[PDB]
Design a protein around this motif. Sequence first.
Motif, mmCIF file in Angstrom:
data_model
loop_
_atom_site.group_PDB
_atom_site.id
_atom_site.type_symbol
_atom_site.label_atom_id
_atom_site.label_comp_id
_atom_site.label_asym_id
_atom_site.label_seq_id
_atom_site.Cartn_x
_atom_site.Cartn_y
_atom_site.Cartn_z
ATOM 1 N N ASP A 48 0.815 -1.183 0.000
ATOM 2 C CA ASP A 48 0.000 0.000 0.000
ATOM 3 C C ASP A 48 0.866 1.256 0.000
ATOM 4 O OD1 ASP A 48 -2.239 -1.436 0.005
ATOM 5 O OD2 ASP A 48 -2.819 -0.956 2.010
ATOM 6 N N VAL A 49 1.908 1.263 0.813
ATOM 7 C CA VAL A 49 2.747 2.438 0.826
ATOM 8 C C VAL A 49 3.463 2.645 -0.513
ATOM 9 C CG1 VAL A 49 4.718 3.536 1.920
ATOM 10 C CG2 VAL A 49 2.958 2.396 3.267
ATOM 11 N N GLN A 50 3.940 1.573 -1.165
ATOM 12 C CA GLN A 50 4.645 1.709 -2.435
ATOM 13 C C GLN A 50 3.688 2.155 -3.549
ATOM 14 O OE1 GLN A 50 8.145 -1.818 -2.060
ATOM 15 N NE2 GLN A 50 6.049 -2.337 -2.660
ATOM 16 N N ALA A 51 2.429 1.742 -3.467
ATOM 17 C CA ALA A 51 1.437 2.206 -4.445
ATOM 18 C C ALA A 51 1.264 3.730 -4.361
ATOM 19 C CB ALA A 51 0.086 1.513 -4.220
ATOM 20 N N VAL A 52 1.714 4.363 -3.286
ATOM 21 C CA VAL A 52 1.548 5.818 -3.205
ATOM 22 C C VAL A 52 2.369 6.468 -4.312
ATOM 23 C CG1 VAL A 52 1.700 7.900 -1.764
ATOM 24 C CG2 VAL A 52 1.038 5.712 -0.792
ATOM 25 N N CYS A 53 3.413 5.789 -4.793
ATOM 26 C CA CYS A 53 4.244 6.374 -5.836
ATOM 27 C C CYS A 53 3.507 6.542 -7.138
ATOM 28 C CB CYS A 53 5.486 5.541 -6.059
ATOM 29 S SG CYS A 53 6.523 5.625 -4.643
ATOM 30 N N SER A 54 2.317 5.963 -7.250
ATOM 31 C CA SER A 54 1.500 6.256 -8.420
ATOM 32 C C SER A 54 0.167 6.886 -8.039
ATOM 33 C CB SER A 54 1.311 4.996 -9.284
ATOM 34 O OG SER A 54 0.884 3.925 -8.489
ATOM 35 N N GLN A 55 0.110 7.514 -6.872
ATOM 36 C CA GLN A 55 -1.113 8.227 -6.455
ATOM 37 C C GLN A 55 -1.019 9.757 -6.602
ATOM 38 O OE1 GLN A 55 -2.474 6.430 -2.881
ATOM 39 N NE2 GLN A 55 -2.291 4.354 -3.716
ATOM 40 N N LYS A 56 -1.367 10.614 -5.629
ATOM 41 C CA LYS A 56 -1.561 12.005 -6.134
ATOM 42 C C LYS A 56 -0.253 12.786 -6.221
ATOM 43 C CE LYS A 56 -3.336 16.302 -4.572
ATOM 44 N NZ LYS A 56 -4.390 16.960 -3.760
ATOM 45 N N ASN A 57 0.098 13.382 -7.346
ATOM 46 C CA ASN A 57 1.447 13.924 -7.510
ATOM 47 C C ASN A 57 1.358 15.303 -6.915
ATOM 48 O OD1 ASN A 57 3.660 15.162 -10.227
ATOM 49 N ND2 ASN A 57 4.241 14.223 -8.291
ATOM 50 N N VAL A 58 2.254 15.651 -6.003
ATOM 51 C CA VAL A 58 2.205 17.005 -5.419
ATOM 52 C C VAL A 58 3.652 17.520 -5.266
ATOM 53 C CG1 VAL A 58 0.094 16.571 -4.116
ATOM 54 C CG2 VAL A 58 2.302 16.043 -3.112
ATOM 55 N N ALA A 59 3.841 18.788 -5.026
ATOM 56 C CA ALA A 59 5.189 19.257 -4.757
ATOM 57 C C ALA A 59 5.795 18.762 -3.425
ATOM 58 C CB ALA A 59 5.238 20.756 -4.845
ATOM 59 N N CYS A 60 7.079 18.421 -3.464
ATOM 60 C CA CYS A 60 7.861 18.189 -2.261
ATOM 61 C C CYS A 60 8.225 19.501 -1.614
ATOM 62 C CB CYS A 60 9.174 17.454 -2.516
ATOM 63 S SG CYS A 60 9.000 15.944 -3.467
ATOM 64 N N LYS A 61 8.476 19.410 -0.324
ATOM 65 C CA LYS A 61 8.813 20.561 0.464
ATOM 66 C C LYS A 61 10.094 21.201 0.000
ATOM 67 C CE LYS A 61 6.386 19.382 4.618
ATOM 68 N NZ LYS A 61 6.459 18.650 5.909
ATOM 69 N N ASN A 62 11.015 20.442 -0.573
ATOM 70 C CA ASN A 62 12.233 21.027 -1.162
ATOM 71 C C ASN A 62 12.055 21.509 -2.586
ATOM 72 O OD1 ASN A 62 12.170 18.835 -2.896
ATOM 73 N ND2 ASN A 62 13.897 17.814 -1.885
ATOM 74 N N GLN A 64 11.271 19.925 -5.330
ATOM 75 C CA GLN A 64 11.262 18.859 -6.350
ATOM 76 C C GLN A 64 9.810 18.450 -6.637
ATOM 77 O OE1 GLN A 64 14.376 19.425 -7.235
ATOM 78 N NE2 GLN A 64 14.386 17.238 -7.779
ATOM 79 N N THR A 65 9.567 17.726 -7.734
ATOM 80 C CA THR A 65 8.221 17.354 -8.111
ATOM 81 C C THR A 65 7.852 15.876 -7.891
ATOM 82 O OG1 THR A 65 9.098 16.894 -10.243
ATOM 83 C CG2 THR A 65 8.056 19.039 -9.939
ATOM 84 N N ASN A 66 8.750 15.082 -7.309
ATOM 85 C CA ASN A 66 8.535 13.613 -7.213
ATOM 86 C C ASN A 66 7.926 13.158 -5.870
ATOM 87 O OD1 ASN A 66 11.055 14.463 -6.137
ATOM 88 N ND2 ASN A 66 11.601 12.308 -5.894
ATOM 89 N N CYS A 67 6.939 13.921 -5.383
ATOM 90 C CA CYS A 67 6.195 13.584 -4.204
ATOM 91 C C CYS A 67 4.778 13.190 -4.550
ATOM 92 C CB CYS A 67 6.264 14.697 -3.151
ATOM 93 S SG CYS A 67 7.894 14.723 -2.340
ATOM 94 N N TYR A 68 4.265 12.288 -3.730
ATOM 95 C CA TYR A 68 3.005 11.619 -3.967
ATOM 96 C C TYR A 68 2.283 11.537 -2.644
ATOM 97 C CZ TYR A 68 5.364 10.829 -8.201
ATOM 98 O OH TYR A 68 6.130 11.026 -9.295
ATOM 99 N N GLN A 69 1.008 11.962 -2.669
ATOM 100 C CA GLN A 69 0.085 11.953 -1.528
ATOM 101 C C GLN A 69 -0.942 10.800 -1.682
ATOM 102 O OE1 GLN A 69 -1.454 15.770 -0.205
ATOM 103 N NE2 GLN A 69 -3.462 14.765 -0.187
ATOM 104 N N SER A 70 -1.140 10.099 -0.562
ATOM 105 C CA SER A 70 -2.033 8.936 -0.511
ATOM 106 C C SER A 70 -3.518 9.358 -0.658
ATOM 107 C CB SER A 70 -1.850 8.202 0.809
ATOM 108 O OG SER A 70 -2.366 8.946 1.891
ATOM 109 N N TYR A 71 -4.242 8.736 -1.572
ATOM 110 C CA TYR A 71 -5.660 9.067 -1.748
ATOM 111 C C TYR A 71 -6.422 8.696 -0.506
ATOM 112 C CZ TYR A 71 -4.750 9.641 -6.804
ATOM 113 O OH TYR A 71 -4.264 10.103 -8.027
ATOM 114 N N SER A 72 -6.014 7.645 0.162
ATOM 115 C CA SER A 72 -6.707 7.275 1.415
ATOM 116 C C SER A 72 -5.895 7.742 2.613
ATOM 117 C CB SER A 72 -6.960 5.761 1.453
ATOM 118 O OG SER A 72 -7.500 5.301 0.207
#
Length: 119
Positions: A48-62, A64-72
């Motif tokens: 479930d945690v690894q599936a977050v890498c294909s869930q909601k794409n959002v900005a990282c605090k630094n 960068q653009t490779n951050c992902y937020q969990s739909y659930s």
Amino acid sequence: KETAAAKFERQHMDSSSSNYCNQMMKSRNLTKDRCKPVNTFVHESLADVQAVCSQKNVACKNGQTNCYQSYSTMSITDCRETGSSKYPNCAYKTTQANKHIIVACEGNPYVPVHFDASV
């Protein structure tokens, strides 16, 4: 040589009390060279945690653009170091919550390498 992928698992996965942060911060080696100020653990499956890498794409605090937020929401524990904590007796305030997690992902395969935030 620990992968970034593994260091994420070590620092942030506990798929398995007021005690928890003190022990687990120690057990996971986050007290070894200093008291790491804050850390979060995620009580969900690796899958479930690894599936977050294909869930909601959002900005990282630094920025960068490779951050992902969990739909659930997800069950997590924040460990926050208490002002009375003195290394090497690292002292943590444990806190439960269910929130969306945000992770940075990298690699082939594309997996979580950093915990960015929870919301």
